[PDB]
Symmetry: C2
Amino acid sequence: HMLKLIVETKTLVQSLGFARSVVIPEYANIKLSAKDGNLELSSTNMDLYLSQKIAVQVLSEGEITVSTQTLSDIVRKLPDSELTLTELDIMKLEIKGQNCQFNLFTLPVSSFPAMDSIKPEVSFKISCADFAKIIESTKFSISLDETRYNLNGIYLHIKDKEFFAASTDGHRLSISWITLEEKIKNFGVILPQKSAEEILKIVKDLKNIHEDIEILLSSNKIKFICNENTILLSKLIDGTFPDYSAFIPKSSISKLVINRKIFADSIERIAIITVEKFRAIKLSLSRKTLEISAVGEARGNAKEIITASQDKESFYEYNCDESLVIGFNPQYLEDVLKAVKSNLVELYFSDISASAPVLIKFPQNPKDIFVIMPVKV
Amino acid sequence: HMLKLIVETKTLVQSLGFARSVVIPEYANIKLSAKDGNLELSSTNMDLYLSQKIAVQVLSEGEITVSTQTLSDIVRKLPDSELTLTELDIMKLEIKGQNCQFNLFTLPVSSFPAMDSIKPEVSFKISCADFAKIIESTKFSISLDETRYNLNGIYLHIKDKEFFAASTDGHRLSISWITLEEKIKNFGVILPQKSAEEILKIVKDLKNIHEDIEILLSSNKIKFICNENTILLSKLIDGTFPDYSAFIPKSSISKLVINRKIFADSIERIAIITVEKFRAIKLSLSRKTLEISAVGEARGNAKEIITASQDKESFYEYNCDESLVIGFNPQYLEDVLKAVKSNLVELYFSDISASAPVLIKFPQNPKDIFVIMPVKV
Ligand SMILES: [Cl-]
Ligand SMILES: [Cl-]
């Protein structure tokens, strides 16, 4: 029972790309299992276990483990449209193209870890495109200092018939959600950042983006089954996620509506002049104009004017007689503006003060909510 | 007398790119001098002095110095096709687009160094495209350990009516030359690697690549005048360059001729399996086939076969009844194969031994010569 199979090179390349992004000496290896018409590729690290199955021509069933880096480095440089992989009885894997041959040392399959299991408290199916959106809307506002453990992940939780992703670092809040088909018990987990990054890449793949992903949750792990053939098992962050609806404002006295792109682009160039000790831009809002300005000590200052317009390509509107001057960290604003593809963006102000948290919404994207603490300017 | 000018943004962006690649606190600044229809931009470090002149609308003549990083970071994010630059009397430079304004702190022009001078022993003019070729054929085989000082540059020297570039690291030798229009005294200098990198970028620019570069040499510096308006003054490496014709072989018993691309691509994938402690590939040459193989300890082995062919796209020929087995560092081979755009490449073997230096030539490129020491395999 020795592995032998013919695989489409481009397909193997793509699978190895996911294996590389996942990665103890055993973590440097990938397990290849040829069985029942498929090649199963297994990769694991301290927090993730990834299993991918791809259709191949299974000529002989078997399993080997080999260096992930070595195998992917070779395969992505082979010009052949198909490759033959053969386990030989010298603890070696032969990779054969039309004119070239590579013999890789293999490692004992018995030293490769098998995947653990889950006893889910809840499980449900959502579309890959919906899951990609909620992760893309929350991955950027995860906290990054390792002291606040319960903030270094994305809170995934079911409330009523809705599935939320939420992230915060104490300075901003990001929430994105999906309506579930059936009712389902309320439950929540904190997904580690690396795990979120990996599953996002998997669902965004062109083979998966139009299909569905099953999600299984328990108190100690989460399991993703993406379009049947890709399984990712992840540890969780062991913490309580704060009840974040405490930091969402319930009212507003005024709102800015502005073309998203011109806003993002203006913030970016005005923030160039700032320094790290004072990363802030100032918005001076009026009915007629928006002024975006910043200062940087021993560097200079900058200002851009955006005038009122009802044209979609240059839209700016602020329907309030009272002008408002308010500051923000430009990176936090840019993070939100880049998370959602939308023509317009809306900023809601709780009061006529430069201290209240600001709520950000994109029209034609009602299921995303962002809150940013302002800074004194 | 305060600077004020209108400049095409894209032109300023390109000039600042060269200024950035050049870069003591004074080295962080760029001098802008508006005079007689041009903006002159000066940048300097410990070894280079760069002066660029670009046509602008000089509205008022003057000079300022400002942070290179800050100015380029701002200008490359401005969408305006033209910008106005105005020195104001608060030691500040205003950069104005249509809707935005940046005020940069300036530094005293009197603290910016002026360029030194040259009293050339020889001077001559060659085309930018010819100079680019000889630098591209020699920059990769400069030595990189700082002990052998006289090898960490490109030897530029006039012999008879020919102008040579030559570089070596003790393992390989690269020589490329140009025929000069007039006779000129024999003279040579060692151009530092960074200086070679910078002038190569300048001559390769689309505005300069079809024009000429004047070269002025003295015992202690070299001056380039590229297409009239860009001047680069460089220090030299103070050493004697070895008479390298000692390491060129004068005869050959056999030669391989092979399609350059298939050779480079095969070497690259076969070398994947090697390790750093033994970076070598093996060529087994025969009339009928070329076998390219390698081994990597605790990794595996690899082999590719190239068969005899007279077709240009897959050319392989070796007109010798005696087979030859010879090894090389694959990076040294790849360096040469990537330096010259040519369909075929030729390897000349001094004798039927795996120890003699190998001479490499590209047909339709007679003015390039490369020699590589083989390695035992
Ligand atoms: Cl079988
Ligand atoms: Cl004037």
